[PDB]
């Protein structure tokens, strides 16, 4: 049982995914396999993550014995919202009440516009350099 | 059951009393029983959350029978964030998972740092005039 927006493993693993094809550009085909055992997570879990992906153009397979996956595109091209938006169902930020008036309405808007513009305008590449500070001293929540 | 991140009843009926505050800056103190009646809620329940926004400086009392509330300074000055954060308790954006790394933290630092944004640079007057298009074609979600 998780605190914030419902992001969930789909759009996380499926980031996970690309990350790591994105890091290893140049090293031919990337095995499910290896990022599995490399980050713990279930090899048939990812195999239904990579589906949506490459049928959306992220990812492309190579089969046979030395194939696997590699990122189909610029890591300074492709978005966070590319991959998120592929893997997980609507993402609700906010929810609007039945009595609430335009007012109140604005201000969802706003923040609405918001993350969907981090989303839109923030890339792998983006993601890789990690360069802003996260001003968690401790733990896991992202307060606003 | 309601959808999105956790704004409960508290920092939505302080906006709208701030709100209601907001438009009647210069009819006198306005009472807690006719924003109630005119918007279909808990007199008691507003009691209950005029506490925080007076002790604030968000609001001013004043006393007896012609008495009730004020604005205690200007809607163009007062923000969504003074009255959201002193109603609600830490609203989380996003929960980050044991095993992420640094690439998915920078996604969830660059949403939050977003919409903390909104927050701190929304003011209750940007609110009364609600000029941003919601897109919503119906229904209540804001997503992302
Ligand atoms: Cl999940
Ligand atoms: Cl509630």
Known sequence: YFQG???TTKGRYGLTITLELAKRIGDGPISLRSIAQDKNLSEHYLEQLIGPLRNAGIVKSIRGAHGGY???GDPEKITAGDIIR???GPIVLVESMEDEEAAQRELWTR???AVRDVLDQTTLSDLLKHSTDSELTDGYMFYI
């Open 70 to 72: 590699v990122l189909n």
């Open 5 to 7: 927006m419902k992001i």
């Open 86 to 88: 592929t893997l997980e």
């Open 111 to 113: 923040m609405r516009n």
